[model samples]
Target: SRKIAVGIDNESGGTWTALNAYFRSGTTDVILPEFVPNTKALLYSGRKDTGPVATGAVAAFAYYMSSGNTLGVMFSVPFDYNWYSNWWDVKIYSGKRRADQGMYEDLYYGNPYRGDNGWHEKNLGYGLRMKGIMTSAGEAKMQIKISR
Candidate 1:
C-alpha cells in the first residue's frame, strides 16, 4: 500500500496570504502570518487538528513501508518576495521516516522547482517515484501539488 501527504513551508520574508494542500487524505487551506522569530508550525495529514499553521506548513508526506520504513517523499516552498527567486523543493528518503520542518531543514538540497509550471518528477528506483506541480503566484502567492 502507498500513502501520501502534501504541505508547504514558508521561507519567504513576508507572510503567506494564502496556503493550501490537496492529497488523498484531504485538503487543508490557511492564511499564514509571518513566523514568530525562531518559532514555527505544522498541520498533519492536511488536517489542522493534528497540528497548527503559522509559518506556512503542513504534514502531507508520502510513504512506502515494507521493512523498517523504506521510502518517503516530502517538499517545501520558498515564496521569496523577489519573484524570480521563488522556488520549491522535494526530497525523497529511505530507511527512516521523518515529518515537518525539522526534517525539511535537515534534508534540504538542490533540484528545486521554479521558473515554470508543469509536472516535475523524481525517480527513486525500486518502482518508486515522486511528482509535483508548482504554479507560481508572482512571489507574494503560490500553489503546490504532490504525487507518488
Candidate 2:
C-alpha cells in the first residue's frame, strides 16, 4: 500500500545534524518525489533512548517560505517494547516549530494513529495535507510528504 519512494539512507541512527544539513542543503540523499514548489519538506533522524525500556527519540527540522505560509512536521515514537516493531507518527502542524523532547512526547501520545509502516495521508488545517510512510514494521526509515 506504499505510494511513495523510500530512500536508502532515510532511517534511524542518522544524526540530527546530518539530516538537517541534508535538508537545508537540498542533498540528493533527502529525496521525496512528493515535495513540490508548494510543499515544505522535513527530514528527521531518531534513535532509541538508552534505558531499561527504550523509547524512540527524534529531532525533526524544516524551514519556511513558499506562499509565506508557515507549517511544521512533528513526530513521535513510543517504547515499542516488541523491539521487533516500532510505531511512529509524523503530523503537520500550523506553525514554524522545532522538535524537542517535550514536543516529541506530545506528538507521540497525542495522535490517534500509532502505526505508519504504509502510506498514511490526511487533510490538515491551512489548505494542506500530510502524507508519509516508514520503510517497514521495525525500520524507522521514513518518507514524509507535505503539500498544499
Candidate 3:
C-alpha cells in the first residue's frame, strides 16, 4: 500500500510544493510540494475538490481498485468564487458537505469515488493530474499523486 497526504496550505501558495514533499522527496520540509502527478517519477493516482479561496482533482472507484496500485487523495477545499473541488471518499466516510469551506482527509480500503471532484474515477491508470486554479481562472500549478 502507498501513502498520500491531504490538506490545505496556509498561504494558498505552497500546496503544490507541500504536496510534492509528501508524495516525493523524503525531505519533509515546508519548502516544496509533494509529487507532481502525470510525471514519470511521481506517477498519477489521485484528485482534489474546492470553494471560496479556490482546486487538482478525479477518477472511477472500481477501476482504481483493479489497478493494483493504492489510490490516495489530498483534499483542501477552499473558498472560491465557485465550489469546484472533488471530495475524496473512503469506506464509511464521505467528504461531502461542501457545506464546509475547507475540511478533512480520510483514505481507505475500497478507494472509492464521489462528486465535486467534478469528474469520475476510471480503471485506466494514471492521469491523476493535480491542478491549482484561482478564482480568476489562473492555473498556478499542476500538482501531486495517488492510485491502485
Q: Write the residue-wise lDDT of candidate 2 on 1-148 in tens digits.
A: 1111232222221111211211211112233232323222333344443345443433334333243333334433434435533344444434444434433455545663455477777775556566666644433466655555
Candidate 3: C-alpha lDDT: 0.26
- Candidate 2 is scored at a TM of 0.51
Q: What is the C-alpha lDDT of each candidate?
A: 0.35, 0.40, 0.26
lDDT of 1 by residue, 88-115 (tens): 4555455545444433444333555552
Candidate 2 residue 131 Cα shift, in angstroms, is: 1.3
Pairs in steric clash, model 2: none
Candidate 3, 32-91: lDDT as tens digits = 234433322332332233232122322212111222322334332222426543234422
Candidate with the larger TM-score of 1 and 3: 1
Ranking by TM-score: 2, 1, 3
Instruction: List TM-scores for all candidates, in order.
Output: 0.42, 0.51, 0.20
Q: In what order do the candidates fall by lDDT, top score first?
A: 2, 1, 3
lDDT of candidate 1 at residue 40, scale 0 to 100:
31
Error of 2 at 117 (Å): 1.3
Better of 2 and 3 by TM-score: 2
Q: Which prediction has the highest lDDT against the true structure?
A: 2
